[PDB]
Design a protein around this ligand. Structure first.
Ligand SMILES: [Mg+2]
Ligand SMILES: [Zn+2]
Length: 1382
């Protein structure tokens, strides 16, 4: 599917050949393998001679540790002036930085009063009951009758044991976590009952209240009994309605501290309690932080619904505090902390999200800090000052967790580059200027001081004993950056930076074409030709001035040298000379485009498509938005006599209509546009219509776009060609710019990355099909050769082996990195390189045809159009319109803003941007990889033919590791002035080919780093912090059986790198505790929290559940565990194979199990062993997460090769249907609403099933220590009551079938005997030692296929369609493991 372009009518008259002539004029790609050496030698000679005198700059220095340390110490001396800070002062001032940090260390607490808090009175029960009633459907009447009952309950329960919990001053929380007063409600009730009494005018003032209360109670009970849930299980005392109720309310008195939140800075400088009394050694502050973070996260449940107040209670070591806020939704707001004994402890302005990683993780952090400290305790010279390290690490962790910012991420992230350059031999001089950020708040400077004090302590100039544990310590500290987030604080603020990045390098080159208009103008062609000519006019090392680094452009001489060298077979190894280069022209599916991405749809008002924005509508929208944002803010904080208010009021009086020494002309001419707009169509028109009209290219999802495109064809195959060249809407002829359907179009977006933010170009569908052809072509042609690791898997292992071998012999390594790889490449370079290669085959015609098709495709991509986001245009228009008659801000005028202004004050406004110096970021990956491979091979060959050494390369897109040989390493130690100039020539000659080296490169003899894989001599570097941070906040709003396997895979992957097993057990326990908060009945299938090391390296997922089940009921699986051995012995040989498949697989379960046990001459299981059962919800239909799967997956994988099957799959995917904390809130809310499917048709609850089980007095629950519920039921109740026993499932049958399947899928050591060995002696061990290990590696196939459908609790075949190769584990964790005989 490469030569299908011959179906269209060619039209390539005049524009096409000029570019070819420009790119093929002076490229002498015919040199031999003997002339290039002369040019290379002469270039080397002239470069060295010019460098010796000093007309060229080096950009490479020799490492000196003292200067590096001093420069790091003196890195921020403009606001933080100091020389050395004492640890005691840092500790003293750390506990008093911010209210959040001051609250976690105060001396708070109270005896028996805190013991009463372990009890719940008759006040919260009524609150929960009324919340449940209000959840269903049954207006001030309801609120009054609902918040009076809880008041009555509190009054009743305040005269029995003298306790008042759930109060604040004179306020009480009633229904929606609200805060309501006392007197106002009393008088409202009095007036409402007075109106009732007036309407009734024998009845008394105490009878109407009880009558209405009982009228509501019966309706509530009927409503709860209608669905199927009981009412008497809530434990509510109905006697709270006293006979004398009306007079009870009106004679109540109470006294307390009146609460009030603050909004300024000077109101939080008064602290009631002691400012600090907690030591860092214990884990007291972590529990408080966890509770506060949970309270903050829970603050998003509130719906829309004096004025308002919302509250959330939380306990702390007996005490009870309340977090109060005054605005709903999910965004930045004001929070205050209150108590009932004092008032307004503190107040802050935190954000509800970005607070997930600390919810129930209070012992994982302590353990990881302990295991990080345990890495350096064996240093003789670092014995005295050991507690300071622990304290500093604790402060760093607590500070990063308590104040999640974005500029604190870039500070801990850059320490890795410094520590990599510390143990190296050479480094770029522009390295210090790269480790510098812009800090604003007073907290980040404290973090910088803390990390500086820690680095100056760990890396002093008098300790050289280990020199390996400190490296791991610093590198793992630098990886705490992953603990915060990967989201973005704002949206508009981070959308202008991307546009400025996109437009910055394209303006200096002086080539910015704004509006192509889809019919190219003569000036556009002339400018494109001139820029193409200019792009190939780079000179260097042979001129009057010399080279000019860091500029876009390519030299003709080096391009000719590269092409000639490639065409002579001089860049090939000894294995490629045994064959001939193949052309993939003659040697795919379209459903791939249905992936989980986005797409853009066009819009036509006529035969043509709109491409330009309107001017008057944009002005009207800008004025409307300014008035909208003004109406509230400028009405309060603007002086009436001020000019700004006087002019903004006039501006507001232009659209709504409910001293001019400034811009009189502008204000006089702006009236007409608004008047015409309002005449042409509480505003005076429709905002929605205007917003829809101004938008030109709305977005749309991916699946339905493909479905609607496919639903108008007549081909019975799902191929790429059938959707593009054959349709009712297909191009007829194609021209120089593009097909008659129009030129290509893209749109801009940003990714979500830790640190910076990458670009993203998202195109339409036609471009999506067009790109894949070139993508696949270049991918195959690069796969022909060896050297690329972008998609390969084995060469990555080969590179790892090479790195290990190089490090083992102390050879020199070079870790590289290229900058601006995306926004400064060009498709013209690819076209010019393609037009000079010789894919030698004995067929000229096919080569010419393929080259022509590739050339025209590259030309099509050369004339692409790029869209400008709507929000950026709106913001720029607001800035222009406001700062033309007003004087509001006018602070900074960036060079990227005058570009909008100059075009604004000419008439039409910018719509698109087109140019030549931009390559699609993440679009043409394979072409760039292939070019990089060729260029690196040529550079290595040149360096080889200059000096007497050889160099390797493992380039992958933009990354590189280079491994020098022995000769270069020996040369580096005896002639530094030669090695340095060789490096200089390498840098210059790499720059000459449009490849720029970043200042973060390393030339080291101690560590190698390729794709974030550090290697040293002997030891290994486990990124424990990265894995822990990734595993912490990695849950979504899925069904609770997919999260278990999602976390299990992550833990299995992380175990194989060096993480101990106790951390994994704690993480799994935290996950189970998080699930328990949602009140989900745990089954013995989710997770196992007692795994040893053999359960991760030898056993698979199915073995851990087997081990967990083997512990719940012992002495009952032993009988089965020998019948299974006999069955395996008689089945592997081929004895029976008949009745087990049909007479024992599809029948009654218990009877068949007993018969199977009896048949093999083995004692049948005891009668009191089949009584064990477990509850399995959704045993009939799957749960409703939104408000046989094996055969269906096989169908979706095979029948989707045609049109109808693919369409059905797309329809089902469409009919399937923000944050991480929002996902948790959604999971908590959804799991508990209905989440139940009935037998025939209905929706039920979870509480109803529990009530039904509690009703029958024959079922007994059993709980494990961590908590896994499993039931015991008698055989006599096996049937007769089938209403609820349907959901239960037996235990021994599933255990047997899963054990048999696991024995089939692995060896036979599983059915041995578990004899946990622990009689081994003791040893003072070291936490730094590792041992590589390997895994434990027809009728059986269809046997497993048939067995898969019966025991439907897991999906074993799902895990098949990766498998880890080697496992690296400690030595002390490898001994104490279970052992089993064959
Ligand atoms: Mg790298
Ligand atoms: Zn009480």
């Amino acid at each position: 599917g490469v030569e299908s372009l011959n179906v269209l009518l060619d039209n390539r008259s005049s524009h096409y050949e000029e570019i070819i002539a420009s790119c093929h004029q002076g490229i002498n790609n015919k040199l031999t393998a003997h002339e290039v050496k002369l040019q290379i030698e002469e270039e080397y000679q002239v470069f060295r001679n010019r460098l010796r005198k000093g007309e060229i700059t080096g950009q490479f220095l020799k490492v000196d540790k003292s200067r590096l340390l001093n420069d790091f110490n003196n890195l921020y001396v403009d606001e933080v002036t100091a020389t050395k800070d004492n640890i005691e002062h840092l500790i003293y001032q750390f506990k008093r930085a911010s209210p959040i940090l001051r609250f976690l260390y105060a001396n708070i607490g109270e005896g028996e009063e805190r013991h009463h808090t372990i009890k719940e009175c008759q006040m919260q029960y009524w609150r929960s009951f009324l919340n449940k009633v209000k959840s269903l459907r049954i207006r001030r009447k309801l609120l009054l009758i609902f918040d009076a009952l809880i008041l009555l309950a509190s009054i009743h329960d305040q005269t029995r044991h003298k306790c008042s919990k759930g109060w604040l001053g004179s306020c009480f929380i009633s229904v929606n976590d609200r805060l309501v007063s006392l007197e106002s409600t009393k008088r409202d009730l009095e007036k409402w009952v007075g109106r009732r009494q007036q309407s009734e005018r024998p009845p008394d003032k105490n009878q109407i209240l009880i009558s209405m209360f009982q009228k509501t109670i019966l309706k509530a009970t009927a409503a709860l009994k209608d669905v199927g849930i009981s009412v008497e299980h809530y434990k509510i005392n109905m006697e709270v309605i006293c006979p004398d109720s009306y007079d009870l309310i009106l004679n109540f008195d109470v006294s307390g501290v009146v609460p009030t939140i603050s909004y300024q800075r000077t109101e939080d400088e008064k602290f009631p309690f002691i400012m600090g009394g907690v030591e860092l050694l214990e884990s007291t502050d972590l529990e408080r932080l966890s509770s506060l973070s949970l309270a903050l996260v829970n603050s998003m449940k509130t719906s829309s619904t004096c004025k308002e107040a919302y509250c959330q209670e939380f306990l702390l070591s007996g005490a009870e505090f309340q977090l109060i806020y005054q605005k709903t939704g999910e965004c930045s707001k004001c929070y205050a902390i209150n108590d009932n004994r004092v008032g307004e402890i503190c107040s802050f302005y935190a954000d509800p999200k970005r607070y997930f990683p600390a919810i129930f993780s209070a012992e994982v952090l302590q353990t990881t800090v302990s295991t990080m400290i345990s890495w350096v305790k064996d240093c003789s010279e670092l014995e005295e000052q050991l507690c300071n390290i622990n304290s500093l690490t604790k402060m760093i962790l607590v500070l990063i967790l308590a104040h999640p910012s974005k500029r604190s991420q870039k500070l801990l992230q850059n320490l890795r580059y410094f520590i990599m350059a510390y143990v190296s031999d050479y480094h770029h001089k522009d390295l210090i200027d790269k480790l510098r950020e812009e800090l604003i708040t007073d907290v980040e400077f404290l973090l910088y001081r803390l990390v500086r004090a820690l680095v100056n302590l760990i890396l002093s100039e008098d300790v050289k004993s280990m020199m390996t544990n400190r490296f791991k310590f610093i590198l793992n500290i630098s990886y705490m950056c992953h603990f915060i987030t990967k989201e973005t604080p704002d949206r508009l603020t981070d959308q202008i930076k991307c546009f400025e990045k996109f437009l910055e390098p394209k303006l200096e080159f002086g080539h910015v074409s704004i509006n192509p208009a889809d019919v190219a103008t003569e000036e556009e062609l002339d400018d494109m030709v001139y820029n193409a000519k200019k792009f190939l006019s780079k000179e260097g090392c042979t001129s009057i001035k010399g080279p000019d680094y860091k500029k876009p452009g390519v030299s003709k001489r080096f391009l000719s040298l590269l092409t000639s060298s490639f065409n002579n077979g001089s860049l090939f190894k000894e294995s490629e000379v045994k064959r001939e280069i193949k052309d993939p022209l003659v040697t795919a599916t379209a459903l791939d485009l249905a992936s989980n991405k986005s797409v853009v749809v066009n819009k036509y008002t006529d035969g043509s498509r709109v491409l330009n924005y309107d001017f008057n509508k944009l002005t009207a929208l800008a004025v409307s938005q300014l008035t909208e944002v003004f109406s509230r803010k400028g009405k309060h904080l603007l002086n009436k006599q001020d000019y700004d208010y006087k002019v903004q009021q006039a501006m507001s009086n232009l659209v709504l209509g409910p001293l001019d020494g400034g811009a009189s002309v502008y204000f006089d001419q702006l009236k007409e546009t608004v008047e015409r707009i309002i005449d042409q169509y509480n505003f005076k028109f429709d905002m929605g219509r205007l917003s829809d009209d101004v938008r030109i290219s709305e977005r749309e999802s991916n699946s339905e776009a493909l479905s609607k495109a496919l639903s108008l064809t007549n081909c019975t195959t799902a191929m790429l060609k059938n959707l593009c060249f054959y349709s009712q809407e297909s191009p007829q002829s194609y021209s120089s710019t593009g097909p008659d359907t129009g030129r290509l179009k893209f749109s801009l977006s940003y990714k979500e990355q830790v640190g910076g933010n990458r670009e993203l170009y998202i195109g339409d569908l036609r471009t999506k099909m067009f790109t894949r052809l070139i993508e696949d072509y270049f991918e195959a042609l690069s796969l022909q050769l060896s050297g690329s690791c972008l998609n390969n898997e084995r060469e990555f292992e080969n590179a790892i082996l090479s790195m290990k071998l190089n490090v083992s012999l102390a050879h020199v390594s070079y870790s590289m990195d290229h900058s601006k790889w995306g926004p400064m490449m060009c498709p013209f370079l690819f076209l010019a390189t393609l037009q000079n290669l010789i894919f030698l085959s004995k067929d000229l015609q096919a080569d010419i045809k393929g080259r022509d098709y590739l050339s025209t495709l590259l030309t099509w991509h050369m004339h692409k159009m790029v869209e400008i986001p709507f929000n950026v245009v709106s913001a720029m228009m607001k800035s222009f319109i406001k700062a033309q008659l007003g004087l509001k801000k006018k602070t900074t005028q960036s060079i990227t803003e005058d570009f909008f202004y100059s075009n604004f004050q000419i008439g039409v406004v910018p719509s698109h941007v087109s140019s030549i110096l931009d390559m699609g970021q993440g679009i043409l990956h394979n072409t760039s990889d292939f070019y990089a491979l060729i260029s690196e091979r040529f550079i290595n060959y040149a360096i080889s033919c200059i000096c007497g050494g050889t160099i390797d390369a493992y380039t992958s897109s933009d990354d590189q590791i280079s491994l020098f040989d022995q000769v270069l390493t020996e040369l580096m130690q005896r002639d530094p002035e030669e090695f340095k100039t060789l490096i200089e020539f390498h840098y210059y000659m790499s720059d000459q080919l449009n490849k720029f080296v970043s200042p973060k490169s390393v030339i080291g003899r101690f560590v190698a780093e390729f794709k974030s894989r550090f290697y040293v001599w002997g030891d290994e570097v486990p990124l424990l912090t990265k894995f822990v941070a990734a595993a912490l906040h990695n849950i979504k709003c899925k069904e609770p059986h997919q999260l278990a396997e999602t976390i299990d895979t992550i833990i299995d992957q992380s175990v194989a790198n060096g993480v101990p097993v106790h951390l994994c057990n704690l993480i799994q326990k935290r996950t189970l505790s998080l699930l328990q908060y949602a009140r989900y009945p745990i089954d013995p299938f989710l997770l196992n929290c007692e795994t040893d090391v053999r359960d991760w390296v030898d056993g698979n997922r199915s073995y851990r559940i087997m081990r967990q089940i083997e512990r719940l009921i012992p002495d009952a699986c032993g009988r089965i565990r020998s019948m299974l051995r006999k069955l395996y012995n008689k089945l592997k040989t081929g004895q029976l194979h008949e009745e087990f498949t049909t007479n024992y697989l599809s029948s009654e379960h218990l009877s068949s199990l007993s018969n199977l046990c009896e048949l093999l001459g083995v004692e049948p299981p005891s009668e009191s062993d089949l009584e064990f059962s477990w509850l399995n919800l959704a045993a009939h239909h799957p749960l409703r997460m939104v408000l046989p799967t094996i055969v269906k997956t096989i169908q979706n994988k095979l029948s989707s090769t045609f049109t109808r099957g693919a369409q059905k799959l797309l329809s089902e995917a469409i009919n399937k249907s923000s944050s991480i904390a929002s996902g948790f809130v959604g999971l908590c809310r959804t799991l508990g609403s209905k989440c139940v499917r009935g037998p025939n048709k209905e929706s039920l609850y979870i509480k109803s099933i529990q009530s039904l089980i509690s009703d029958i007095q024959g079922i007994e629950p059993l709980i494990d220590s961590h908590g896994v519920q499993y039931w015991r039921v008698p055989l006599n109740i096996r049937d007769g009551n089938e209403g609820v026993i349907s959901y239960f499932r037996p235990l021994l049958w599933d255990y047997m079938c899963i054990s048999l399947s696991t024995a089939i899928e692995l060896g036979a050591w599983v059915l041995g005997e578990p004899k946990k060995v622990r009689v081994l002696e003791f040893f003072k061990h070291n936490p730094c030692d590792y041992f590589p290990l390997k895994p434990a590696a027809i009728k059986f196939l269809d046997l497993c296929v048939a067995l898969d459908v019966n025991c439907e609790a897991l999906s074993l075949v799902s895990h098949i369609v990766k498998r880890e190769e080697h496992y690296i584990v400690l030595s002390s964790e490898l001994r104490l493991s279970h052992t089993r005989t064959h």
